């Protein structure tokens, strides 16, 4: 009934079906939702997580095309804070214990990952068309 504001974040490098189904699942947590999507910066992703193929600007321009995405914060903060939830009027964080405070506040919503659909999995399928010998 009342509109519920959902927040999900990530790298979204080389956007594939796995990200899409995750975002859809976040978007449909409730009947009436606004899904805000946060895109991690190149520097912090590279320092804290690992290598990223596409720049922040490219990764954001691709997310803009996904039907479930209502709003994008680019770049997003690397750590979600309670002050971040308050300023953007976020009701729930959708993710796939650093996150214990979100669970304690009733604001953690799980979303599953789909294995086997990644961009790299597809390139693996390309290479398997070449018998080793």
Name the binding residues for phosphocholine: 11, 49
Q: Cβ closer to ligand NCc1ccncc1: 3 or 101?
A: 101
18 binds ligand NCc1ccncc1, rule: CB under 6 A = no
20 binds a second copy, rule: CB under 8 A = yes
Query: What is the DSSP code string of 10-43?
Result: E--TT--HHHHHHHHHHHTSSSSEEEEEEEE-HH
Q: For residue 93, how many other CB atoms are within 10 A of its CB?
A: 22
List beta partners, residue 35: 6
Encoded one letter per residue, x for contact with a second copy by CB under 8 A and - for no contact, window 77-106 reads ------------------------------
Structure tokens at 29: 């947590």
What is the Cα–Cα distance from 108 to 104, expressed in whole angstroms?
8
Q: Cβ closer to a second copy: 84 or 119?
A: 119
Size of the residue set binding a second copy (CB under 8 A): 24
């Amino acid at each position: 009934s009342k509109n519920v504001v959902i927040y999900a974040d990530g790298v979204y490098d080389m956007l594939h079906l796995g990200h899409m189904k995750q975002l859809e699942q976040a978007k449909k947590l409730f009947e009436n939702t606004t899904l805000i999507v946060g895109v991690t910066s190149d520097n912090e992703t590279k320092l804290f997580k690992g290598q990223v193929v596409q720049t922040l600007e490219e990764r954001t321009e691709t997310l803009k095309h996904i039907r479930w995405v209502d709003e994008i914060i680019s770049p997003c903060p690397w750590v979600v804070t309670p002050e971040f939830l308050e300023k953007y009027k976020i009701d729930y964080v959708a993710h796939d214990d650093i996150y214990a405070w979100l669970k304690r506040a009733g604001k953690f919503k799980a979303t599953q990952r789909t294995e086997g659909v990644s961009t790299t999995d597809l390139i693996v399928r390309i290479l398997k068309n070449y018998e080793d010998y």
